């Protein structure tokens, strides 16, 4: 949101979920956010780099969380052959 | 589906049910039947003049208890009779009789668990002179 002149005039833009594109507010106290570690050519881990996933409050309560991890992670090449579209 | 019809050519059921059970609104039924003439002692008027039969003393039974002073009267346009009320000559000293008086109503509804009992009217002037002009003593009752 921005005025006639052009500057943003919210307080501060909030975080969308990543499995269902909802919006996570300041009292969604089950809204997990999870990092994984990039890897090295020798087989070690860079201490400073991540890949970040944000999951909403209610994809976890129904129990649909871990499958939504496997769907999300496998697009980024983390896994192979553990999730399948045509169920 | 709400239990009422929604379709487009349905305006006749909708308007004939509404005036059908509009007869439970309590003071729309009073207005179309016109019970203001057939039952009310005034007939539909603000004030009314009568002529006083006699002094009465009435009392209030449960929790309250004191000495409420009222008055009989007989209306000129009608012949029927009612019992009015006169406000706070609590000294017991303004009996008056065979006089012309002007009544009014209370802004009426009440609580008679203390039994401030079943009268409906009051008195605003007597023999051509206001009541408060005598209580605040600005006139005195006209006679020769």
């Amino acid at each position: 949101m921005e005025n006639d002149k052009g500057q943003l005039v919210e307080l501060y833009v909030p975080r969308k979920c990543s499995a269902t594109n909802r919006i996570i507010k300041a009292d969604d106290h089950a809204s997990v956010q999870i990092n994984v570690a990039k890897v090295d050519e020798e087989g070690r881990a860079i201490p400073g780099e991540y890949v970040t996933y944000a999951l909403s409050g209610y994809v976890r309560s129904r129990g649909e969380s871990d499958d939504s991890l496997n769907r999300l992670a496998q697009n980024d090449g983390l896994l192979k052959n553990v999730w399948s579209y045509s169920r | 589906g709400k239990g009422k019809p929604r379709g487009l050519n349905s305006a006749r059921k909708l308007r004939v049910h509404r005036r059908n059970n509009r007869w439970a609104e309590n003071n729309y039924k009073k207005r179309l039947l016109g019970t203001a003439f057939k039952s009310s002692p005034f007939g539909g008027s603000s004030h009314a003049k009568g002529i006083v039969l006699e002094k009465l003393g009435i009392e209030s039974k449960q929790p309250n208890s004191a000495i409420r002073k009222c008055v009989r009267v007989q209306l000129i346009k009608n012949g029927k009779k009612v019992t009015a009320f006169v406000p706070n000559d609590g000294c017991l000293n303004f009996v008056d009789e065979n006089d012309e008086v002007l009544l009014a109503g209370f802004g009426r509804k009440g609580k008679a668990k203390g039994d401030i009992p079943g009268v409906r009217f009051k008195v605003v002037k007597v023999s051509g002179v206001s009541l408060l002009a005598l209580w605040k003593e600005k006139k005195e009752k006209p006679r020769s």
Partner: protein
């Protein structure tokens, strides 16, 4: 809708009527009596067109001018 008189018939017309508070329609109808020349042959159930002339009877002001069958 009726051909039981001698040289007159009765026409039924149908419309709808709008009630603004309820935003809807309701059906109505009106019957008109007209006159039939013996040039035409009209049985019940047909659909005619009719035009207006000066007062013919107590209750008549139209007579048929075309006809199309059922």
């Amino acid at each position: 809708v009726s051909t039981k008189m001698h040289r007159t018939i009765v026409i039924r017309r149908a419309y709808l009527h709008y009630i603004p508070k309820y935003n809807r329609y309701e059906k109505r109808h009106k019957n008109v009596p007209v006159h039939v020349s013996p040039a035409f042959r009209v049985q019940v159930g047909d659909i005619v067109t009719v035009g207006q002339c000066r007062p013919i009877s107590k209750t008549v002001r139209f007579n048929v001018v075309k006809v199309s069958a059922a």
